[PDB]
Amino acid sequence: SSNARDEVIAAIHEEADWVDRTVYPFESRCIGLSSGAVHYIDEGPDDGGRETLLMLHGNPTWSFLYRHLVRDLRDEYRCVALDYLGFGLSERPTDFSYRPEDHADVVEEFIDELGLEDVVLVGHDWGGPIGFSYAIDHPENVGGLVVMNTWMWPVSDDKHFSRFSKLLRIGRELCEFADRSRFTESAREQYRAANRGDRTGTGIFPQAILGSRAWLSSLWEQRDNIADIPARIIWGMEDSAFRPAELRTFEALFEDSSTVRLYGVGHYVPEEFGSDLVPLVREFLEEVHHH
Amino acid sequence: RDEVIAAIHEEADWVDRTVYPFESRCIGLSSGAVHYIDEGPDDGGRETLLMLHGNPTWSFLYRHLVRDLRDEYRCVALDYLGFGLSERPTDFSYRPEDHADVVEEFIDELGLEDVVLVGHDWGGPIGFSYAIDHPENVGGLVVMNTWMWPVSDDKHFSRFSKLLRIGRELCERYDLFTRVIMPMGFADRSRFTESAREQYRAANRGDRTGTGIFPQAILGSRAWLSSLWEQRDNIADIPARIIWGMEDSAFRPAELRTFEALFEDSSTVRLYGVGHYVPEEFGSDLVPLVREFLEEVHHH
Amino acid sequence: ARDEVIAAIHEEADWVDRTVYPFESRCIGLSSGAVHYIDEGPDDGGRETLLMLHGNPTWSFLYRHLVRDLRDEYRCVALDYLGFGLSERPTDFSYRPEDHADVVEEFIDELGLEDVVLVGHDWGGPIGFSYAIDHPENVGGLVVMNTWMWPVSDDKHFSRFSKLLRIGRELCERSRFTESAREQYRAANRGDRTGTGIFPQAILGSRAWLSSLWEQRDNIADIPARIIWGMEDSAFRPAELRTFEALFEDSSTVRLYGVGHYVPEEFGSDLVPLVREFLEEVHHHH
Amino acid sequence: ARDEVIAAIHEEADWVDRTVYPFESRCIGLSSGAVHYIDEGPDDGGRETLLMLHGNPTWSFLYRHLVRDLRDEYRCVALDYLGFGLSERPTDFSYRPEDHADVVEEFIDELGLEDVVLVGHDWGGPIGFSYAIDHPENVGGLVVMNTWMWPVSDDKHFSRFSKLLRIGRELCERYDLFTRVIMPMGFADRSRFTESAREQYRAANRGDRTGTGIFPQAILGSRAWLSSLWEQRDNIADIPARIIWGMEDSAFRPAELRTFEALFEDSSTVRLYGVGHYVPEEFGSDLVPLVREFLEEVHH
């Protein structure tokens, strides 16, 4: 497995000069987990800081999505962000399913290797369900939830998500008005560049929206594990994928929670709202710090 | 008021009583007089039920429940002002936030206790707007295709409310609500029986102002809906049975999931092949699902 | 007679912009003098009764947007203080806030309003808060905009403002009104201007009365209130806002960035949904 | 161990005028760094226990007048934050106010202080309230002097001062304009900021004074923490409080004082006309009866 770490770090020299370290200044680090070698950010004060944050991306994004948080919270907080296998700088193993139920096991295996504790989970798109796994069955070790444009329920009866899955594709390209397109051409290329190579994970996810109903049920049916974890929900209101209908569902679920509604903001909240997200997260981290 | 109560009685029965066998009773309330069902055992019923209709429906919507559950239960069902045979007063607002005041005023004059509320469509919010401030007089909730939150940011609800806001004056002219909106609320177009279809269309004539104000109020009453949602935890622990027409395009499963999160004492019936008007389309087959709830409630 | 004298002058006061101020003008002969007031709503008295109290040097034209857009379901009442608007300007009244407070109680009693929601801006704070201090059982809730309820004679900010030399408060202290609106105020501030000049003095001249409200503020601390703050206001800073946020157990704060002192004017029709969100909350305590 | 090196700086800190600071120098090796502190009183625990928390660029010498005289009957504890007085100046610490409050919690628990009365001045307010707000049953009362507990990023008053000192930090640190310039304008009578004390504060704040310079930045930069306090203000409001305020302070106005008078359910205010920001200096031993008066009333 230590050989698998070499494979990633070799790729960092052979195939990662394109990463714009001016906006992604963070040190690259790698762990050879059993399913394969992940790439991760871990940056913060050497104390380990006021809190440890774990940031989980979606499809077809990667940890570059969180660079605004990591840059501005690594002052007082330990920021950790993980490239899923198949994505970012992580290994692209032939062996793996890329099914959400299996990515969730990689996240748990990642947490329990690094020994992260009382973590705050930041979750976007599939990073919701994937992170809610560890919150469903390790709620003692989760400090709080940062929720953005995602869900925690089976959706196979709603024609909306059904249509999105059943449509023909190789993978989810980023784009399914305040401006005609929502990303800087700089960032849009940094995402496209990471989606070079084996992109299989980008197409398994939209299929698994229906194909993992059992796993989504396995979260939804024991959601009561999570309902008293403190949470803040930060929602791109102009998202076509996750409507305010999904938002109302979380506003019922949580006892101790607060909601930020971002009008004019679409799906990729940590891009489109940028560094204005930081004070909303930081407000929550200090609210969490009273334990 | 007294001549109006008599006027409500004496020309009532264009109704097919052979399917609506109930004794019609009338209350003089401050806003005007209302017509209601009150049917059950002569002793204090095993449980007490109050059934609140959607638009443009009326107590006749619940006839299948009353017909069977009056074996054991006090079935109450009420026509709001403007609907069924209730008064159509010149001065009332027909606002849903005011209907909830009238249902409070009604409930206090009947003095119901540990009430189980059956909420369809607008009857949901109208019921919840009593249960959320008298929760310790409410015994349980039967939820069918409804909601309890402001939908003003969802394009899905927006388009329909805007469209019917625009077309209101025309829809009132020719009753497009019963002639079109009700027909589309079924998964089997034949199940909206020719008798029922004609009965609704006969009922909702004269002044029908209430039929057209409701689809505006989806957006127009956001402040009241907001107040309910902000108070939601006053209701989160009452027992609820949720029965949902899975073919309804108005209230998706995405609304259903919100009730499933709101109520911890709840369970859900997914009526695949049933549309919005579950008490019509599922008919007498609905009755056992209400009994299964009322047993678990009464056995505590 | 005294109310008939207002009937005379208001028939001469055809300058009022009845396009935006269509409301039926009504008048009461109170003991201190004749007041002019709005009373608009359904014949039912509606879901709530609102009393709306203006500031200096404004008048009930300030609240026209609330009245116009709430009168379909709620009873909106708005009062011109003596000395202001179309109300009488008697030689014998003090125009001191501690006496306006008594007139507001008298007005409420003679109209017979019950479980009122009070809407207050500038001096319409303390003057309204006086009633809510000593009849808190008759108050359904409070709408709080850019005002205060405490003695400030040690605060250099309010001290300078009162100790500055003037005839009366001018509206503006590159502009935040329409000239339609400005003239609608400036016309009413023609004639006997006296009350406009006592208000800025009484900020210090009535410190004792302001103490009396402050020292019994617990009479009010659990009345529900919604606070709606013009954040660019120089007169009533966030420093005042924090003091209300501490006082009220049951309250919410709405912060209007880019809005100045005259929140009802500068926020206009967009204020109405903030009040409805409050009225439909208060209605469940009732 | 590093704490023994803190004793080594004591073995070189003869400059501390013990004729006015007649207290035993004590040290705790906390995890973030070693802190110097005072602990004085009756030979077994006094009638009540005091913990005294200072502002910028002050230190426990600010409280010398209280420790000198209240140790007759009370346990006086007084602390130097990391970065200040004779406490350690670690190279890795943040010197953030919200981290000082974590060190103060860690200090309180290591000493096992119980039913504490907290004295807070300037930043010592927030730093103290960030314990009393989540351990209210371990706190008996609050002494409040010229301080606050809320974000002020919308107040151009506090914004102007913080932004100015954010810009000027690089020079204000190098030349110590905090003690030399900022402290004097915190007095209503410069003759009451004695030439002795002015040296004492300036001697205590030579060396690495990073923490003195970050403090005025944090007025804005700590907004998230200040919010997390202010949103929980009701956790403190029932604790009894004595407020003693320098009315000639331009930094914390009586408009801040009104906020505390609104917040507390049980409070008394002392209005020191003719006294500035540094009340414990400028009001000296005359302050002490106002603290004793409070502790005698706290003692039920």
Numbering used by the authors:
A (entry chain H): 5 to 180, 194 to 308
B (entry chain G): 9 to 308
C (entry chain J): 8 to 180, 197 to 309
D (entry chain I): 8 to 307
Any passages from the paper?
Haloalkane dehalogenases (EC 3.8.1.5, HLDs) are a group of enzymes that catalyze the hydrolytic cleavage of a carbon–halogen bond in a range of halogenated organic compounds. Here we probe the structural organization of DhmeA, a subfamily III HLD‐like enzyme from the archaeon Haloferax mediterranei, by combining cryo‐electron microscopy (cryo‐EM) and x‐ray crystallography. A distinct catalytic pentad forms the active site of HLD enzymes: a nucleophile aspartic acid, a histidine base, a catalytic acid (aspartic or glutamic acid) and two halide stabilizing residues (two tryptophans or tryptophan + asparagine) (Janssen, 2004). We show that full‐length wild‐type DhmeA forms diverse quaternary structures, ranging from small oligomers to large supramolecular ring‐like assemblies of various sizes and symmetries.
We noted that the solvent‐exposed L10 loop, connecting α4 and α5' helices in the cap domain, displays a unique feature containing two glycine residues (G173, G174) in DhmeA. We thus constructed a DhmeA mutant lacking these two glycines, hereafter referred to as DhmeA∆GG. The final model contains 10 DhmeA molecules in the asymmetric unit and has a low deviation from the ideal geometry. The 3.3 Å crystal structure reveals that DhmeAΔGG forms a ring‐like 20‐mer structure with outer and inner diameter of ~200 and ~80 Å, respectively. The crystallographic ring contains three types of assembly interfaces, namely di‐, tetra‐, and multimerization interface. An unusual striking feature of the DhmeAΔGG organization is that the first monomeric unit in the homodimer has a complete, properly folded helical cap domain, while the cap domain of the second monomeric unit is partially unfolded and distorted. Notably, the electron density map between residues R181 and D196, encompassing α5′ and α5 helices, is missing, and this part could not be built into the model. Therefore, we suggest that the cap domain of DhmeA protein may naturally unfold, which leads to an uncovering of the active site.
